[PDB]
Amino acid sequence: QLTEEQIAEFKEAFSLYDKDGDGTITTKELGTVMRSLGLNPTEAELQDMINEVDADGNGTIDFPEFLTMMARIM
Ligand SMILES: [Ca+2]
Ligand SMILES: [Ca+2]
């Protein structure tokens, strides 16, 4: 049962990571969110996190890939 409200909240969450609005999440953008949680990862640690959900091999996180991260934390 997929609603427009569901889609809107997912969009809101993606947008919190994708600050510059170009549709992909970079290590810089991931780092800003993790440091706000209280963590302090290195650049390489941030790339190992992307590598985990990077289903198309392009090095950064896109919308469907972000959706699988959300599915795992729920
Ligand atoms: Ca971006
Ligand atoms: Ca990707």
Short mmCIF file of N, CA and C and ligand atoms in Angstrom, two decimals:
data_model
loop_
_atom_site.label_atom_id
_atom_site.label_comp_id
_atom_site.label_asym_id
_atom_site.label_seq_id
_atom_site.Cartn_x
_atom_site.Cartn_y
_atom_site.Cartn_z
N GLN A 1 0.83 -1.24 0.00
CA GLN A 1 0.00 0.00 0.00
C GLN A 1 0.87 1.29 0.00
N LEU A 2 1.31 1.78 -1.17
CA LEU A 2 2.19 2.97 -1.17
C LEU A 2 1.48 4.32 -1.41
N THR A 3 1.52 5.20 -0.40
CA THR A 3 0.81 6.48 -0.45
C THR A 3 1.66 7.69 -0.83
N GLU A 4 1.00 8.82 -1.12
CA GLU A 4 1.75 10.02 -1.45
C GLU A 4 2.38 10.63 -0.19
N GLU A 5 1.76 10.42 0.97
CA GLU A 5 2.36 10.85 2.24
C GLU A 5 3.70 10.13 2.54
N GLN A 6 3.72 8.82 2.32
CA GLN A 6 4.92 7.98 2.46
C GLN A 6 6.04 8.52 1.57
N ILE A 7 5.72 8.72 0.29
CA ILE A 7 6.69 9.25 -0.65
C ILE A 7 7.21 10.61 -0.19
N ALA A 8 6.33 11.46 0.35
CA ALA A 8 6.76 12.79 0.78
C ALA A 8 7.74 12.75 1.95
N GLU A 9 7.50 11.87 2.91
CA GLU A 9 8.41 11.73 4.05
C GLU A 9 9.73 11.14 3.63
N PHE A 10 9.72 10.25 2.66
CA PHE A 10 10.97 9.68 2.22
C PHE A 10 11.76 10.77 1.53
N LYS A 11 11.09 11.57 0.70
CA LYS A 11 11.72 12.71 0.05
C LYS A 11 12.32 13.69 1.05
N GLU A 12 11.61 13.92 2.15
CA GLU A 12 12.07 14.86 3.18
C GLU A 12 13.37 14.34 3.78
N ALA A 13 13.38 13.06 4.11
CA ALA A 13 14.57 12.46 4.70
C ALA A 13 15.77 12.46 3.74
N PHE A 14 15.58 12.04 2.48
CA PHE A 14 16.65 12.11 1.45
C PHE A 14 17.22 13.52 1.41
N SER A 15 16.35 14.52 1.51
CA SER A 15 16.77 15.91 1.32
C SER A 15 17.65 16.47 2.43
N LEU A 16 17.47 15.91 3.61
CA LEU A 16 18.26 16.23 4.78
C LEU A 16 19.73 15.80 4.59
N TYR A 17 19.93 14.72 3.83
CA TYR A 17 21.28 14.27 3.48
C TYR A 17 21.76 15.03 2.23
N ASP A 18 20.91 15.14 1.22
CA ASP A 18 21.31 15.81 -0.01
C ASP A 18 21.01 17.33 0.08
N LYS A 19 21.95 18.02 0.73
CA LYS A 19 21.88 19.45 1.06
C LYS A 19 21.98 20.38 -0.14
N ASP A 20 22.76 19.99 -1.14
CA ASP A 20 22.98 20.86 -2.29
C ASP A 20 21.96 20.56 -3.39
N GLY A 21 21.08 19.60 -3.11
CA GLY A 21 19.99 19.30 -4.01
C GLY A 21 20.27 18.69 -5.38
N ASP A 22 21.46 18.14 -5.62
CA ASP A 22 21.74 17.53 -6.92
C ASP A 22 21.35 16.06 -7.08
N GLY A 23 20.57 15.53 -6.14
CA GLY A 23 20.09 14.17 -6.31
C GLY A 23 21.01 12.99 -5.98
N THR A 24 22.27 13.23 -5.64
CA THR A 24 23.12 12.15 -5.15
C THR A 24 23.69 12.53 -3.78
N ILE A 25 23.92 11.54 -2.92
CA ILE A 25 24.54 11.77 -1.61
C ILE A 25 26.04 11.41 -1.64
N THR A 26 26.89 12.39 -1.29
CA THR A 26 28.36 12.26 -1.32
C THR A 26 28.93 11.92 0.07
N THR A 27 30.22 11.59 0.15
CA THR A 27 30.82 11.38 1.47
C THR A 27 30.79 12.67 2.31
N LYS A 28 30.90 13.83 1.68
CA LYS A 28 30.85 15.11 2.41
C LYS A 28 29.51 15.31 3.13
N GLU A 29 28.43 15.03 2.39
CA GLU A 29 27.07 15.18 2.88
C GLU A 29 26.74 14.14 3.96
N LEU A 30 27.22 12.90 3.78
CA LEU A 30 27.01 11.85 4.76
C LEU A 30 27.73 12.23 6.07
N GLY A 31 28.96 12.69 5.94
CA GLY A 31 29.74 13.13 7.08
C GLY A 31 29.08 14.22 7.92
N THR A 32 28.42 15.19 7.28
CA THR A 32 27.77 16.27 8.03
C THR A 32 26.65 15.74 8.94
N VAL A 33 25.87 14.78 8.44
CA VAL A 33 24.79 14.15 9.22
C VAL A 33 25.34 13.28 10.37
N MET A 34 26.37 12.50 10.08
CA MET A 34 26.92 11.63 11.11
C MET A 34 27.56 12.43 12.25
N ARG A 35 28.27 13.50 11.91
CA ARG A 35 28.84 14.35 12.95
C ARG A 35 27.75 15.02 13.82
N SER A 36 26.60 15.36 13.23
CA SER A 36 25.44 15.88 13.99
C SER A 36 24.83 14.86 14.96
N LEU A 37 24.97 13.56 14.65
CA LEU A 37 24.52 12.49 15.56
C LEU A 37 25.47 12.30 16.75
N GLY A 38 26.69 12.79 16.64
CA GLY A 38 27.67 12.58 17.71
C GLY A 38 28.85 11.70 17.32
N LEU A 39 28.95 11.32 16.06
CA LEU A 39 30.05 10.49 15.59
C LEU A 39 31.12 11.32 14.90
N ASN A 40 32.25 10.69 14.61
CA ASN A 40 33.35 11.41 13.98
C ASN A 40 34.09 10.51 13.00
N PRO A 41 33.42 10.09 11.92
CA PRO A 41 34.07 9.18 10.96
C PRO A 41 35.11 9.82 10.04
N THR A 42 36.08 9.00 9.61
CA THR A 42 37.05 9.40 8.59
C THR A 42 36.41 9.29 7.21
N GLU A 43 37.02 9.93 6.22
CA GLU A 43 36.59 9.86 4.83
C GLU A 43 36.42 8.41 4.33
N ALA A 44 37.36 7.54 4.68
CA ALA A 44 37.35 6.14 4.23
C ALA A 44 36.22 5.31 4.84
N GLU A 45 35.92 5.62 6.10
CA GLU A 45 34.82 5.00 6.84
C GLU A 45 33.49 5.37 6.20
N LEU A 46 33.39 6.64 5.79
CA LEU A 46 32.22 7.15 5.08
C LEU A 46 32.11 6.43 3.71
N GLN A 47 33.23 6.17 3.02
CA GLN A 47 33.13 5.43 1.75
C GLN A 47 32.74 3.95 1.93
N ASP A 48 33.25 3.28 2.98
CA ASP A 48 32.81 1.91 3.30
C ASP A 48 31.27 1.84 3.55
N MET A 49 30.67 2.89 4.15
CA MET A 49 29.21 2.95 4.36
C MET A 49 28.46 3.03 3.03
N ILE A 50 28.94 3.88 2.12
CA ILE A 50 28.31 4.01 0.80
C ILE A 50 28.40 2.68 0.04
N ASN A 51 29.58 2.07 0.08
CA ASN A 51 29.90 0.82 -0.62
C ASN A 51 28.87 -0.28 -0.29
N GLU A 52 28.44 -0.34 0.97
CA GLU A 52 27.39 -1.25 1.45
C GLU A 52 26.03 -1.20 0.73
N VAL A 53 25.55 -0.01 0.39
CA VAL A 53 24.26 0.08 -0.30
C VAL A 53 24.38 0.55 -1.76
N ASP A 54 25.61 0.72 -2.25
CA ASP A 54 25.87 1.20 -3.62
C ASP A 54 25.58 0.13 -4.69
N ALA A 55 24.29 -0.09 -4.95
CA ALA A 55 23.83 -1.18 -5.81
C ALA A 55 24.23 -1.07 -7.30
N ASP A 56 24.50 0.15 -7.77
CA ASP A 56 24.90 0.33 -9.18
C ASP A 56 26.39 0.60 -9.41
N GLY A 57 27.17 0.63 -8.34
CA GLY A 57 28.62 0.71 -8.47
C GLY A 57 29.21 2.08 -8.77
N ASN A 58 28.38 3.11 -8.73
CA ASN A 58 28.86 4.44 -9.13
C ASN A 58 29.53 5.29 -8.05
N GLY A 59 29.64 4.78 -6.83
CA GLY A 59 30.40 5.48 -5.81
C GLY A 59 29.65 6.42 -4.87
N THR A 60 28.40 6.73 -5.19
CA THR A 60 27.57 7.61 -4.37
C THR A 60 26.18 6.98 -4.18
N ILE A 61 25.39 7.54 -3.26
CA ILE A 61 24.06 6.99 -2.93
C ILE A 61 22.92 7.74 -3.63
N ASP A 62 22.07 7.02 -4.37
CA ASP A 62 20.91 7.64 -5.01
C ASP A 62 19.61 7.29 -4.27
N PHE A 63 18.47 7.73 -4.80
CA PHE A 63 17.20 7.56 -4.08
C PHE A 63 16.81 6.11 -3.76
N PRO A 64 16.80 5.20 -4.75
CA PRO A 64 16.43 3.82 -4.39
C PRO A 64 17.40 3.17 -3.40
N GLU A 65 18.65 3.60 -3.44
CA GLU A 65 19.67 3.02 -2.58
C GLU A 65 19.48 3.47 -1.13
N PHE A 66 19.01 4.72 -0.97
CA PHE A 66 18.74 5.33 0.31
C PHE A 66 17.54 4.62 0.96
N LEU A 67 16.56 4.33 0.12
CA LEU A 67 15.38 3.57 0.50
C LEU A 67 15.73 2.20 1.14
N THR A 68 16.76 1.51 0.65
CA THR A 68 17.15 0.24 1.29
C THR A 68 17.80 0.47 2.69
N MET A 69 18.54 1.57 2.86
CA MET A 69 19.04 1.92 4.20
C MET A 69 17.88 2.12 5.18
N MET A 70 16.84 2.85 4.75
CA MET A 70 15.69 3.10 5.62
C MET A 70 14.99 1.79 5.99
N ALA A 71 14.87 0.91 5.01
CA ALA A 71 14.24 -0.39 5.21
C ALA A 71 14.98 -1.24 6.25
N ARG A 72 16.29 -1.05 6.36
CA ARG A 72 17.08 -1.81 7.33
C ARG A 72 16.96 -1.22 8.76
N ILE A 73 16.98 0.11 8.92
CA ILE A 73 16.79 0.66 10.26
C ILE A 73 15.38 0.50 10.85
N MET A 74 14.34 0.40 10.01
CA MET A 74 12.99 0.27 10.56
C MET A 74 12.82 -1.05 11.30
CA CA B 1 24.16 16.03 -3.19
CA CA B 2 24.97 4.38 -6.35
#
